[PDB]
Design a protein around this nucleic acid. Structure first.
Ligand SMILES: [Zn+2]
Ligand SMILES: [Zn+2]
Length: 108
DNA sequence: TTCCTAAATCAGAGATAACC
DNA sequence: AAGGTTATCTCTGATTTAGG
């Protein structure tokens, strides 16, 4: 009622408790999964917080540089350096890796 | 307590324009 | 000189947070 856990995954919380063939408790997810696939529900740890992880290195999807004064994003939604972004939004074509310049230039 | 609000802060898209 | 790449500037929107 309160100290029960899913015997397959160990989840202590669930929308609706279910029973396996042997009468033990399965969380809704696991229970449904078994009646569907006749196989235990595989445990698969959650993915990246898209931050506490993700932002652990950022290189442009096009030229793969790691530095830029401003990160933009391509259609696909991935980050791209300022240069590659501006170039594509002007020519609707990717910036040729033959343009990668040495270091970073400043102005004014 | 929890909710809601405010306002900072953050993130980028555009604009502007500096330098080769 | 004029052009073209793309640093910066300007904001609009989305997040993040301290309070009440
Ligand atoms: Zn389970
Ligand atoms: Zn790039």
């Amino acid at each position: 009622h309160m100290g029960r856990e899913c015997v397959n995954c160990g989840a202590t919380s669930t929308p609706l408790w279910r029973r396996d063939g042997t009468g033990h408790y399965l969380c809704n997810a696991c229970g449904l999964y078994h009646k569907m696939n006749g196989q235990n529900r595989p445990l698969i740890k959650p993915k990246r917080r898209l931050s506490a992880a993700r932002r652990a290195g950022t290189s442009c999807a096009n030229c793969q540089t790691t530095t830029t004064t401003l990160w933009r994003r391509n259609a696909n939604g991935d980050p791209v350096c300022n240069a590659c972004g501006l170039y594509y939004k002007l020519h609707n074509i990717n910036r040729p890796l033959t343009m990668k310049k040495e270091g970073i230039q400043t102005r004014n």
